[PDB]
Amino acid sequence: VLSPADKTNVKAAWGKVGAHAGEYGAEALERMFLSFPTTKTYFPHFDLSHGSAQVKGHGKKVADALTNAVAHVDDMPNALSALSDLHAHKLRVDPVNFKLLSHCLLVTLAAHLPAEFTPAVHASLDKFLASVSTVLTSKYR
């Protein structure tokens, strides 16, 4: 569970992301594709080339969803229900891949927010992504 501290940490670091969320979402995806190539099996229909608009497009959607979870940090299960259903029933992404993306998202933020990416913030952001992943995977079976 996320503590008040965590909550403050996340709103703060995400606060800084602001308008770059979309681009950071795209970048986390590319990092993931390059470091964990097995994740590509889920996007056979995508142009995964550098600067692919499909990836750009996708990065934004993911960032929008994270932004929405931050806005509803106290009711994530409900704020993300629809996305939980989609992933459980249609996409059927194996659960292990959530940890991979989470990891690439953390690397992206670190790379962009040197001043805010403190030990404390890092830990809060990691618990946060773990919680988002748990929600998205809750309806799998």
Binding site: P37, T41, R92, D94, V96, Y140, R141
Partner: protein, 146 residues
């Protein structure tokens, strides 16, 4: 493999007693039921709405036999699973888009089916050697992913 002659013989000897037809259909079926998301690759098989519908689906059973067959033949090249599954590794990557994590889910299901079938015979030391083989197989199959 990092199989001990003793470990090799145990694997080999239990396998000799296996009905691939039955074990193949049961392993794949149990997979589809325990880990529902693995069904994303078998939409064309039909109705997998229930344990019963999965366990009974002939397409499932027949796919199961094909998979354990290939597995079975790999036990003959236990000293080069890599070379034995190369082509199958590319296929799974490039044509099927199967996440290699699935190879590990199956392996564990396989071990549960064997324990199920052999009771007493499937001892801790025997499971240990089989765990090494299933891992080995999954690694070989995942080897050509890019």
């Amino acid at each position: 493999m990092h199989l001990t002659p003793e470990e090799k013989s145990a694997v080999t000897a239990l396998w000799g007693k296996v009905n691939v037809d039955e074990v193949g259909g049961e392993a794949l079926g149990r997979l589809l039921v325990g880990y529902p998301w693995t069904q994303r690759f078998f939409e064309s098989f039909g109705d997998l709405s229930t344990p019963d519908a999965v366990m009974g689906n002939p397409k499932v059973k027949a796919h199961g036999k094909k998979v354990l067959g290939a597995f079975s033949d790999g036990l003959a090249h236990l000293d080069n699973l890599k070379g034995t599954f190369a082509t199958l590794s590319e296929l799974h990557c490039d044509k099927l888009h199967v996440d290699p994590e699935n190879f590990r889910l199956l392996g564990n299901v396989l071990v549960c089916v064997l324990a199920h079938h052999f009771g007493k015979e499937f001892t801790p030391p025997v499971q240990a050697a089989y765990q090494k083989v299933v891992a080995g197989v999954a690694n070989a199959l995942a080897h050509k992913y890019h």
